[PDB]
Amino acid sequence: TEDEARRRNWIERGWAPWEEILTPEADFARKSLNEGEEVPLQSPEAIEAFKMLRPSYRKKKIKEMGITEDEWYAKQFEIRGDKPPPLDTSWAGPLVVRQIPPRDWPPKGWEVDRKELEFIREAHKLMAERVWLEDLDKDLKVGEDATVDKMCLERFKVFLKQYNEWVEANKDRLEEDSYKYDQDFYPGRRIRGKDYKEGMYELPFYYPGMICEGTVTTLHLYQGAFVDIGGVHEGWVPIKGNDWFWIRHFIRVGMHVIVEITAKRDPYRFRFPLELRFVHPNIDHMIFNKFDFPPIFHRDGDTNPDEIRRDCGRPPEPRKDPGSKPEEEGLLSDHPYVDKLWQLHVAEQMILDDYEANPEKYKGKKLSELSDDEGFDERKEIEHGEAYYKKTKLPKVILKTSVKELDLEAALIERKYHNKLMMEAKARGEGYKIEKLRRNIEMDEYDSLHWRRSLEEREALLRDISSRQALGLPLEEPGRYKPGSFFGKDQYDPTSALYQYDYWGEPKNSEISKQERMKDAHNKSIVGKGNVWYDMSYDDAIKQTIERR
Amino acid sequence: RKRNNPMNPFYHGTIRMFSLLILSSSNCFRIGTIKNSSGPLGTAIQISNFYSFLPLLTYNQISVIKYLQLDNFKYIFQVIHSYLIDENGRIFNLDPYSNLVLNPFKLNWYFLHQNYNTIISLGQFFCENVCIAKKEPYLKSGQVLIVQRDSVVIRSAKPYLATPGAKVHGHYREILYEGDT
Amino acid sequence: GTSTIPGFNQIQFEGFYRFIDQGLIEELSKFPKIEDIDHEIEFQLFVETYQLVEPLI
Amino acid sequence: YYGLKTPPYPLDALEPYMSQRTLEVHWGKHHRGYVDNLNKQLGKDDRLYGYTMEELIKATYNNGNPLPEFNNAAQVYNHDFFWESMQPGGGDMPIKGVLEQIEKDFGSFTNFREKFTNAALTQFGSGWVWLVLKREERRLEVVKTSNAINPLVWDDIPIINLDVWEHSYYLDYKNERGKYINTFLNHLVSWNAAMSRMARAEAFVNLGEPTIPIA
Amino acid sequence: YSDSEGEMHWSTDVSHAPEFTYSNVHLLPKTSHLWILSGGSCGSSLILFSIHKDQDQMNIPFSDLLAKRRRNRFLIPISVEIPINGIFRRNSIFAFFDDPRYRRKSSGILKY
Amino acid sequence: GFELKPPPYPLDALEPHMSRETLDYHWGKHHKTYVENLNKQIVGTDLDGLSLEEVVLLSYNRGNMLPAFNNAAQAWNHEFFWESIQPGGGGKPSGDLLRLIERDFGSFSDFVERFKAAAASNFGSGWTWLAYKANRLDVANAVNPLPKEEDKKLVIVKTPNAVNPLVWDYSPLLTIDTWEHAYYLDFENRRIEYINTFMEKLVSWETVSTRLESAMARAAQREQ
Amino acid sequence: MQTPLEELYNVKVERKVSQRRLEELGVSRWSVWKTGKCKLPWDWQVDQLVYIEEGEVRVVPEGSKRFMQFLAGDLVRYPKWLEADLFFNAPYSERYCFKAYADD
Amino acid sequence: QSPGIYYQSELDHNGISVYTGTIISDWGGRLELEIDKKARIWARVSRKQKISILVLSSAMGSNLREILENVCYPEIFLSFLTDKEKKKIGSKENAILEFYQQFSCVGGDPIFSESLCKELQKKFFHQRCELGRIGRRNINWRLNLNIPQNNIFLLPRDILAAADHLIGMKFGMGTLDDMNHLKNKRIRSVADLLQDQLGLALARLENVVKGTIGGAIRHKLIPTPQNLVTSTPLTTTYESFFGLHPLSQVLD
Numbered sequence A: 001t002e003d004e005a006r007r008r009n010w011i012e013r014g015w016a017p018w019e020e021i022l023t024p025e026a027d028f029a030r031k032s033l034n035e036g037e038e039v040p041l042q043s044p045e046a047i048e049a050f051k052m053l054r055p056s057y058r059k060k061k062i063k064e065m066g067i068t069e070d071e072w073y074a075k076q077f078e079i080r081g082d083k084p085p086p087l088d089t090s091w092a093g094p095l096v097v098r099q100i101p102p103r104d105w106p107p108k109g110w111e112v113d114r115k116e117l118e119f120i121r122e123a124h125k126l127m128a129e130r131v132w133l134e135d136l137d138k139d140l141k142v143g144e145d146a147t148v149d150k151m152c153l154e155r156f157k158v159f160l161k162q163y164n165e166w167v168e169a170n171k172d173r174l175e176e177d178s179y180k181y182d183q184d185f186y187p188g189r190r191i192r193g194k195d196y197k198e199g200m201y202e203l204p205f206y207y208p209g210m211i212c213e214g215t216v217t218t219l220h221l222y223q224g225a226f227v228d229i230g231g232v233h234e235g236w237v238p239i240k241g242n243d244w245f246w247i248r249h250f251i252r253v254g255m256h257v258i259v260e261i262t263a264k265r266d267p268y269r270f271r272f273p274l275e276l277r278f279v280h281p282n283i284d285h286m287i288f289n290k291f292d293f294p295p296i297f298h299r300d301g302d303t304n305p306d307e308i309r310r311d312c313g314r315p316p317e318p319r320k321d322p323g324s325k326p327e328e329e330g331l332l333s334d335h336p337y338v339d340k341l342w343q344l345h346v347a348e349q350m351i352l353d354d355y356e357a358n359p360e361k362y363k364g365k366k367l368s369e370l371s372d373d374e375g376f377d378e379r380k381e382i383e384h385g386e387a388y389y390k391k392t393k394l395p396k397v398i399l400k401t402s403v404k405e406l407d408l409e410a411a412l413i414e415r416k417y418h419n420k421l422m423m424e425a426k427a428r429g430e431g432y433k434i435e436k437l438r439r440n441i442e443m444d445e446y447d448s449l450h451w452r453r454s455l456e457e458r459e460a461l462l463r464d465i466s467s468r469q470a471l472g473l474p475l476e477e478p479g480r481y482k483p484g485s486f487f488g489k490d491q492y493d494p495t496s497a498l499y500q501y502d503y504w505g506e507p508k509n510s511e512i513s514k515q516e517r518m519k520d521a522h523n524k525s526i527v528g529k530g531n532v533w534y535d536m537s538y539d540d541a542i543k544q545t546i547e548r549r
Numbered sequence B: 001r002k003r004n005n006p007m008n009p010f011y012h013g014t015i016r017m018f019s020l021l022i023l024s025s026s027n028c029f030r031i032g033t034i035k036n037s038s039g040p041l042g043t044a045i046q047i048s049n050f051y052s053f054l055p056l057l058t059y060n061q062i063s064v065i066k067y068l069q070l071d072n073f074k075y076i077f078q079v080i081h082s083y084l085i086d087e088n089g090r091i092f093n094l095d096p097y098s099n100l101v102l103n104p105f106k107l108n109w110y111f112l113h114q115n116y117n118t119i120i121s122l123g124q125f126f127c128e129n130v131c132i133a134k135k136e137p138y139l140k141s142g143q144v145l146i147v148q149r150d151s152v153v154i155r156s157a158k159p160y161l162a163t164p165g166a167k168v169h170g171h172y173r174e175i176l177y178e179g180d181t
Numbered sequence C: 001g002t003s004t005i006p007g008f009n010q011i012q013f014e015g016f017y018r019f020i021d022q023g024l025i026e027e028l029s030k031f032p033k034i035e036d037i038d039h040e041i042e043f044q045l046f047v048e049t050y051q052l053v054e055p056l057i
Numbered sequence D: 001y002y003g004l005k006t007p008p009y010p011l012d013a014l015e016p017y018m019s020q021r022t023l024e025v026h027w028g029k030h031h032r033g034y035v036d037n038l039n040k041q042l043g044k045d046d047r048l049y050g051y052t053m054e055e056l057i058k059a060t061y062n063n064g065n066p067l068p069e070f071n072n073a074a075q076v077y078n079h080d081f082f083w084e085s086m087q088p089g090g091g092d093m094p095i096k097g098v099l100e101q102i103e104k105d106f107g108s109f110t111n112f113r114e115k116f117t118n119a120a121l122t123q124f125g126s127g128w129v130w131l132v133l134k135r136e137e138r139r140l141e142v143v144k145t146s147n148a149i150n151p152l153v154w155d156d157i158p159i160i161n162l163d164v165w166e167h168s169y170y171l172d173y174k175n176e177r178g179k180y181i182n183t184f185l186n187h188l189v190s191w192n193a194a195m196s197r198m199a200r201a202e203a204f205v206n207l208g209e210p211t212i213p214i215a
Numbered sequence E: 001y002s003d004s005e006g007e008m009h010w011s012t013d014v015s016h017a018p019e020f021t022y023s024n025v026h027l028l029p030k031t032s033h034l035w036i037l038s039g040g041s042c043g044s045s046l047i048l049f050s051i052h053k054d055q056d057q058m059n060i061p062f063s064d065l066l067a068k069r070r071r072n073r074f075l076i077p078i079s080v081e082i083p084i085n086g087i088f089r090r091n092s093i094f095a096f097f098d099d100p101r102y103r104r105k106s107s108g109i110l111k112y
Numbered sequence F: 001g002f003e004l005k006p007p008p009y010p011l012d013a014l015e016p017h018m019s020r021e022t023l024d025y026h027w028g029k030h031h032k033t034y035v036e037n038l039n040k041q042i043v044g045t046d047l048d049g050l051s052l053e054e055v056v057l058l059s060y061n062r063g064n065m066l067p068a069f070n071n072a073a074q075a076w077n078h079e080f081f082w083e084s085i086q087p088g089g090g091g092k093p094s095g096d097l098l099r100l101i102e103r104d105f106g107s108f109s110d111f112v113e114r115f116k117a118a119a120a121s122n123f124g125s126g127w128t129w130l131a132y133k134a135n136r137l138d139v140a141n142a143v144n145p146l147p148k149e150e151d152k153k154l155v156i157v158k159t160p161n162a163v164n165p166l167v168w169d170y171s172p173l174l175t176i177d178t179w180e181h182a183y184y185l186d187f188e189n190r191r192i193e194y195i196n197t198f199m200e201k202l203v204s205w206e207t208v209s210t211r212l213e214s215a216m217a218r219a220a221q222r223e224q
Numbered sequence G: 001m002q003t004p005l006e007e008l009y010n011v012k013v014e015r016k017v018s019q020r021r022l023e024e025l026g027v028s029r030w031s032v033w034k035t036g037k038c039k040l041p042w043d044w045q046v047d048q049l050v051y052i053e054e055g056e057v058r059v060v061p062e063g064s065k066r067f068m069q070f071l072a073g074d075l076v077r078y079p080k081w082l083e084a085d086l087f088f089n090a091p092y093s094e095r096y097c098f099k100a101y102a103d104d
Numbered sequence H: 001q002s003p004g005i006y007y008q009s010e011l012d013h014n015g016i017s018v019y020t021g022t023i024i025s026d027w028g029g030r031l032e033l034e035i036d037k038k039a040r041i042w043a044r045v046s047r048k049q050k051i052s053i054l055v056l057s058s059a060m061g062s063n064l065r066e067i068l069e070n071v072c073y074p075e076i077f078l079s080f081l082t083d084k085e086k087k088k089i090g091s092k093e094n095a096i097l098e099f100y101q102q103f104s105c106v107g108g109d110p111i112f113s114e115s116l117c118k119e120l121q122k123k124f125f126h127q128r129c130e131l132g133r134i135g136r137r138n139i140n141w142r143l144n145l146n147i148p149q150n151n152i153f154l155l156p157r158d159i160l161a162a163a164d165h166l167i168g169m170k171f172g173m174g175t176l177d178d179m180n181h182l183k184n185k186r187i188r189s190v191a192d193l194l195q196d197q198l199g200l201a202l203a204r205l206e207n208v209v210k211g212t213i214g215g216a217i218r219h220k221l222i223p224t225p226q227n228l229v230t231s232t233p234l235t236t237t238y239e240s241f242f243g244l245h246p247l248s249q250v251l252d
């Protein structure tokens, strides 16, 4: 019906019947077009709108009403429709305050006397003291008994002394950073230039829970009301969208309010470092649209989205769930350094081979004294390229290796030791096989260290799972791994029956058919028509050879 | 997972979301005792009669009917009353019949502004030649986005006249691209 | 064609170049391998070594 | 630093439902120990100092991998909330806006009472039972948590607390947690406190309905 | 057609309910003005949706001993046969071996 | 149908270190309820006929604990707890246990301090265990080709609520109940005094030594 | 940005650890891991305490353009759910221990 | 006309709007869809042959369950499910036989066999459901689908997506196609025609060798690869194209 749809538009889509201030021509167009196309205007509104098409008639009408022209110009910018019920803000007892230094004093990287700081911090335990309204009368100090010198504010005065020292030493640097980072001024930014006045409160002077008196300076339809609370930054009351349709009757520019600080944030990251709520007038019942998160800047140095969301309190970028439990995956034992050890192993072996074949080159030089060739760049150890094999062209990678990272003294003794055994085997009419060398043994011990590291993580993970499942703590990082249908209703699923094209046989021009026929030719050029006698895995076809040997 | 992986450290616009639009200068434009000062009054403390760790401070019309306890009706006030607790637990008022608060920076008493007992309105739409005053330039079409003391920021908008029986293609707040019906 | 009138025969010229440069392969690769009933004798074409010889006349 | 807040009643004011000796150990030893341990931790980290109490609990919760300070910081808030959840001459039924919200979100007060009781009876081991206000859903719910966890870590607003750690009832009821729960709902729970907590929560949730023009 | 990218607004004189339940077409019982509030388009931008949120300010635009066997890879210094494209499909022969024990110089037939 | 066995000593035999009132409630009410509730959840199911250890592993369900796990694990835990103490306990162990303790903790005095600290820092309800770690994992590539014989060691592990080291294939040797009902009638909040009393007056090292022999034989049978 | 990587990623570091703290942690009984010049990607599934005995490592979190540097003598706690790339440019040696919930 | 999907709406004899959507292949194959008076969707392959949407969809491997879930109007689709049709839809093989009965209009019950699919595939799916790269691009953009550009063949969702818009087209969501717009046309130049002749000529040469291969095998002679190949399939295919094709013209 045309009651739920209107309500749905207000709540879901943020509709509001905002006033349209029309010119006489636009006002005539809407009043006359409701009657017909080319017909005598009959309605008193359209007839009057026809007369108002001449500004001379308007001036005569204005004079007959006794008002001025500018007053008439201001009456057209008037809120139409009904008015909201007027506010009735009641005070929940008296306003009782203490002068408590902010908990976050001092700022990061600013050094203060830690003995004075501990004296300051004693006042933070005063929040625990209980105050009853039936007791703010027994020993109330008034008049001459309530002068400032009579009050104990010693801990707050030490904070003021430290605060003033920080202000005098950091005022210029803070203004310089404002110019470096913020190109234009905006409410919530640091007041600078000619608009700055000495005595404005810096951000470390404020803390959540403080009550302030201020004036409304700016209303933003999508952000809220901005209040001057005596600081170098304006406070921000978040109000947006439809709520302003009624709230604009009560929150006006220039009026005096009482606000409470609800949050204080870093102005480099957050647009509005001081977050407020109105205490007087109370408009809690009129605010329905809420900010999920406080708005932030996306600045020049913000290149990693995961870093940005940690700077604020925002969730991680969601991912598709892998569908596999990490505690059920096989352990990892391939040490990443083994690939480097293999390169050194090959470099030593081919250096040893050249030593055997061409020992005349290696005369008078100790192998440990060898140096790389002139042009050896340590930064170009990996060169990517491409090579042609017959007609096929496979890319080829060049792995440059230094001679000074090789242990040729130990390799030569191992090489000579195995030559002697090979010679002795040859003299006996027997063959000799080397099972592994020192570098291969070095690769296994690095693998064993990596395997042990994986085992210890898995064992701790299994205990961690049982503790978290018992105490109802998350197993995965919250916000990560969103479920299905979160990423869209339409997704290409090749396995799904709604995306399959070989229902009536695989197409002959399909990419699958072309690839299947390609490897059949590649295999047939090796094997052909022979029947598969029996097949065995490589791993089980190695043990049996070891057993026979 | 990261461990299964098969650069070396040793070697304008404002987002409008509800669907994304960018607001910038291409679519928003401007049309041009001691003395009381605004600032903090101190930290409001918990009043045990009201059970709340952070004090309620005030009620509105609706919440006073929903949530006001019977024993607390005697404590509802129409004007503000200010009390100060020092670090030794003493309670000060100076004048319990007016609005006096302590300035935390200068450490002096001052009066509050009130005792707490423009032409253009936010969100209004303008046509392309509306007159606000004789001595002022004519307004441009759009919606009032920002209201300040002596200026207003307008978000540019274009009106289309439609007659009865016409059909609008799109829900409210639906994004329409250039050239869309 | 960006700052002059293009050659009036350009459409024909580019089209024939595309036929020689890419069109031949797309059709010569759709030629099926020919196998008999008994699968004894198999005929195939090595398309990567296709050649075009300039006209003798 | 945080002080140890006294309960809003004398330590013998919950008799005979909660004995004076229970209050002396529960508040004077357990709650005091949490405050003292937290204050030592806050004196070594300037960043954790300077958080508000709610901010500290959310920050130390660390999105499900809690920091060493979380258990103390959460427990000091939990116990402060718990003492204010009770009053002499408490129990029976709520009134006014608390009753209407309960009847709207549970169907009736009887339905809420069974949900609260079953959550408290089925919480295994140490933990807490909460009546909370959901921020996103704008409704009341019954939630049970284990050890020191409180609904603040998920941006929910607690309304009523019940401690089901064994130290809160073992001297008076031993293994009979069900009797302890029944006594709490019949003679101790402070619906007056819930009224003010709902009023404070309405500054962030707005359980009402908007006034929509017919224009 | 819309002269510019933007969002739709009407105040009055447009039916809030669509002409049909599925559709996004609304009728006008009276003469009205439809407003297109200007706004920049995201275009082909990604939009992270975890860090880009309402009212954010964007200052930036949107011989076995020489071989090795590892996870899903191996190196080889048996004759290796690689396809013409350098690409293997499932169940592909890459290396064969001619055992001399089955080599013969005389003709015959094979029985198995 | 599992049966609640009594402790291996008279209910007055642990005085004054553990009062009869504690045993009346810990064994007569808490432990009894765990067995009674377990028997209601097993009857008519496939959990019938298996030993309590099998029921604990089955109901754990690789972390997605089934409804019977809390009753089954707690019933096993308390039976283990009553056998861990004796009326004339405390002192020092000997034999292979003392050799293993010194190997894996430096000295007996070092082990006692580490065990007491673990029991004190166990937040909430839970158990603190001395276990013989000879576990095998049900995943791929989880077998050591060349065992070093030092991989089967003693560990101190803490668990919350009803969890015990059986669910990770460890062999428990000693436990202390740090649920508050185990000590609140005798020590109120003073858990440190309860832990110190346990290690000086109550712990039965001969039972711990006996359990170590079975754990060692368990590993020996697996290795053959 | 302005915030250091250690603060953003909750990487507790205790540079120049005293021998007293090492013995309180029982580092002498921790397992040993070592490497040469290489690159190790890892996603931490539990917290890990690492005491560097020789060399240095530069840790680049996933998607990051900056790095954290830890040198010999530092005690590092890598948090659970951290995804990072570890870079080594020289011989490196460490003693480690993985920590489950509670534990240490 | 370029391959793609075109949404038309022709008036019937009574002046009632009827909306039609046609899929054009790279070969000019037309798989027409329509909305009848009873809202039953028919796959008009010819002026006399009509095939229901559900039968065609099920013969391609789409089960009855997913079709209802993924269409904006499942209640419409269920409203036309006769009892006889449901039993055949329940199995993929029976739907193929039902599709063949309607497509061939041959009296009798066919028996599923591999040869039947091969004959059905060439007559219908090789001619009508091979979109090509241009058709896949036009299908994707017109129907707002994120399907990779490499898939040159028709997918079940593409057929299903055409059914969804057809309903939404009848109810005022969208615009009808203009067939005379040049964005719906494509130009075939000398490259396209000369490539067709080469493709046609290579199909003949394959059968030329197939005939010659059989002859050598029947005579047990070793055939030189040359004697298996004669030049006429390539020479005479081009002389016949230039002499007879209406697009080959004597130069003025």
Ligand SMILES: [Fe+3]
Binding pocket: D026, D030, D079, D163, D165, D167, D168
């Ligand atoms: Fe407690």
Ligand SMILES: [Fe+3]
Binding pocket: F026, F030, F078, F177, F179, F181, F182
């Ligand atoms: Fe127990």
